[PDB]
Amino acid sequence: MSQVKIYANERTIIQYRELLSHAIHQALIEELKYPVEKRFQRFISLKPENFIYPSDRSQHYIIIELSMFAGRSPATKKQLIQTLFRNIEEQCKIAPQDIEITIFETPKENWGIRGKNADEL
Amino acid sequence: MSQVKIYANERTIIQYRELLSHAIHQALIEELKYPVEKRFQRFISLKPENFIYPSDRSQHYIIIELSMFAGRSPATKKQLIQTLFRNIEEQCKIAPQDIEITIFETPKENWGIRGKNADEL
Amino acid sequence: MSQVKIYANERTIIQYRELLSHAIHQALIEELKYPVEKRFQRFISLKPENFIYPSDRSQHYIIIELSMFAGRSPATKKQLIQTLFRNIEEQCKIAPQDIEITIFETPKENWGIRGKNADEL
Ligand SMILES: [Cl-]
Ligand SMILES: [Cl-]
Ligand SMILES: [Cl-]
Numbered sequence: 394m395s396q397v398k399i400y401a402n403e404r405t406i407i408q409y410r411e412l413l414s415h416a417i418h419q420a421l422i423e424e425l426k427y428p429v430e431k432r433f434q435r436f437i438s439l440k441p442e443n444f445i446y447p448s449d450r451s452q453h454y455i456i457i458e459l460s461m462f463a464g465r466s467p468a469t470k471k472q473l474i475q476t477l478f479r480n481i482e483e484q485c486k487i488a489p490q491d492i493e494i495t496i497f498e499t500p501k502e503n504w505g506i507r508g509k510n511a512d513e514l
Numbered sequence: 515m516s517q518v519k520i521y522a523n524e525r526t527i528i529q530y531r532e533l534l535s536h537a538i539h540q541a542l543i544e545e546l547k548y549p550v551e552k553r554f555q556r557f558i559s560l561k562p563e564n565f566i567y568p569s570d571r572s573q574h575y576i577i578i579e580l581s582m583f584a585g586r587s588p589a590t591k592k593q594l595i596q597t598l599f600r601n602i603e604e605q606c607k608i609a610p611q612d613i614e615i616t617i618f619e620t621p622k623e624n625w626g627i628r629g630k631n632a633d634e635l
Numbered sequence: 636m637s638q639v640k641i642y643a644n645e646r647t648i649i650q651y652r653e654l655l656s657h658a659i660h661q662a663l664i665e666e667l668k669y670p671v672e673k674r675f676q677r678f679i680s681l682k683p684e685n686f687i688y689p690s691d692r693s694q695h696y697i698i699i700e701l702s703m704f705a706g707r708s709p710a711t712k713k714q715l716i717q718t719l720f721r722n723i724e725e726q727c728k729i730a731p732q733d734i735e736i737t738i739f740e741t742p743k744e745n746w747g748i749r750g751k752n753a754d755e756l
Contacts, residue, residue, distance in 0.1 A: 396577065396616065400677055406564065414566060435521055435577075436564040443648065443678035445656060456638065456677075460616060467744035471754070474747040489750025495638065495702060496745040502588035503617040505595040508610025512592070517698065517737065527685065535687060556642055556698075557685040581737060623709035624738040626716040629731025633713070 394506065395421055400437040400456040402444055409453070409485055410436050416480040417457065424473045453491045455481075462511070463498040470496055515627065516542055521558040521577040523565055530574070530606055531557050537601040538578065545594045574612045576602075583632070584619040591617055636748065637663055642679040642698040644686055651695070651727055652678050658722040659699065666715045695733045697723075704753070705740040712738055 421427040478489045504511035542548040599610045625632035663669040746753035
């Protein structure tokens with residue numbers, strides 16, 4: 394299970410949401426063997442005055458937070474991150490300079506999905 | 515201490531915010547013995563175009579993120595999650611299919627509350 | 636690396652965003668020796684009806700979430716929190732009663748920055 398939040402300037406979301414959505418999901422399919430339908434994304438559309446970051450990232454600075462189950466090795470997580478960079482550059486033509494990713498991890502017993510404790514599925 | 519974020523489509527928040535607020539808080543009172551006043555909730559109201567998830571969850575798909583102190587056992591956390599499901603179904607008549615929960619945990623030394631380091635209280 | 640999210644009522648953000656931005660960043664410079672430019676802040680502007688908390692915090696209740704790399708000692712984290720309280724009180728004249736802070740920690744291998752795996756920098 395992966396829950397994804399994508400924070401960006403409003404205009405970046407307007408223009409790129411669809412392209413980002415597919416790029417991110419393709420990374421998860423490729424790396425983690427997710428089913429095509431298992432896509433869960435929240436785009437957090439910020440007014441620029443509320444999104445403050447260094448001038449060496451462009452108007453298309455994007456922060457991706459992926460909340461996942463614990464357990465993947467550091468090397469597997471690094472590869473996932475590289476694939477997200479790649480897919481976003483290739484499909485969105487946003488430079489890796491403008492993309493930032495953080496993975497958060499929690500044990501399965503911390504999740505409820507479809508009325509079930511996730512450890513029980 | 516529990517900080518709760520509730521992400522949903524705008525219309526779901528409009529119609530259900532009050533009912534969800536009470537249902538969630540009642541779960542915390544029941545399970546964790548919280549005082550009635552110790553309710554801290556942020557409803558994150560999303561335009562549907564920014565909230566992308568599978569078609570087997572309805573317009574009332576809700577994601578609840580509960581940030582709490584570390585230490586509760588896996589079994590206690592699972593029970594908490596079940597009580598949230600129950601209370602939301604009973605009080606909101608939203609099906610468990612549409613409810614998703616993730617607990618995040620941090621040590622007390624990671625928190626500041628009312629000007630104090632939380633470990634010191 | 637520190638990613639900061641600041642949640643507040645809309646009017647609190649309007650009046651205090653600049654003052655909070657400097658106060659928080661100064662705390663990070665002072666405590667963690669951050670460069671002056673390494674400021675990354677997202678202000679999450681909430682309508683009051685969506686921001687529910689006890690009546691003993693004022694209209695200027697602010698929640699600061701700082702996502703950082705793992706490894707700092709509990710004592711170093713507590714000091715950081717105290718400095719944030721101080722700077723916000725001194726520079727914003729918001730009482731510590733109204734300020735809440737939580738630090739989240741993840742290993743470096745969980746981050747992508749400027750196209751790089753953060754552990755590799
Ligand atoms: Cl996805
Ligand atoms: Cl609550
Ligand atoms: Cl900062």
